[PDB]
Amino acid sequence: EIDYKDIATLKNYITESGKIVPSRITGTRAKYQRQLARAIKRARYLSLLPYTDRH
Template sequence: MAFKSRRKYCYFTENNIKEIDYKDVKLLRRFTNDQGKIMPRRVTGSCAKMHRKLVRAIKQSRMICLMPFTDTGVE
């Protein structure tokens, strides 16, 4: 099996995003899976500094009910 190596990069440093807003659900959704779990850094490729901020934002967003703690797809 031949794997084509892809460059992983931090989305935030690449787009020059310094602060992550917990109200920006559209952005935060990209870093959670379908279940609503936060994706690991080895998958998203985001740098450690921004990942910490991202995790904080996602957890704040969960507290104020903008994002789910768990999303099983059943309403």
């Protein structure tokens, strides 16, 4: 749920281009969605999930 380490479950919620899917298509509760954004960008700071495949 609120964790960030489980990159495996976190991966399917992001695009191959590196963007984040909006909650409209997914169909999830908004608070879950903001917690997900928190977790993904916290991962981004620590150099686990790339910003994009540009480099």
